[PDB]
Amino acid sequence: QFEKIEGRMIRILYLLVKPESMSHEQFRKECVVHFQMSAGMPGLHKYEVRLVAGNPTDTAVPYLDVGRIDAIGECWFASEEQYQVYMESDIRKAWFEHGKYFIGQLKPFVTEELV
C-alpha cells in the first residue's frame, strides 16, 4: 500500500549519456557520487540511478534505435508543493552542477501512472 501511493507520485525518468571523453570507469563512480548527493535533497521522496548493462535488439516488435544510453535516472516527488521546494532549492542547483560534470546529454520524461 505504501508502494502503491509511491507509484502514483510525480515521477520523472531520465536517460543519461556520459560525456564523450569520460571513461566508463569514471562514469560509474560519478553515478554513485550523484546518488550519495541525493540524500536529504529538499522536496525529493526518492532517487534511483542504474547503468544500462544490456541492449538486446531482437525485439518481437520493430526495434527502436535511440543510440547509446549509459544510465537511467528517476526522481519521485510526493506532491506539487514538494516538487516546488525541490525546483526552488539551492541544493538542487548544486546537484545539477555535479550533473553537468558527468552527464553529457539528458532526456527527461514526465510520466503518468495509468492504474
Ligand X SMILES: C[C@]1(CC(=O)O)C=CC(=O)O1
Contact between 109 and ligand X by CB under 6 A: the answer reads no
Burial 94-110 (b: 16+ CB within 10 A, else e): ebeeebeebbeeeeeee
Q: Decide: is 67 part of the binding site for ligand X (CB under 6 A).
A: no
Residue 24 assigned ligand-binding role:
no
| C-beta closer to ligand X: residue 23 or 84 | 84
Question: Alpha carbon 60 to chain centroid distance?
Answer: 27
Does the annotation list 34 as a binding residue?
A: yes
**How far apart are the C-alpha atoms of 65 and 55, rounded to whole Å?**
10
Q: Which of 24, 34, 45, 98 is catalytic?
A: 34
Q: Give residues in contact with ligand X (CB under 6 A).
A: 12, 14, 16, 49, 56, 58-60, 73, 75, 95-96, 99, 103, 106, 108
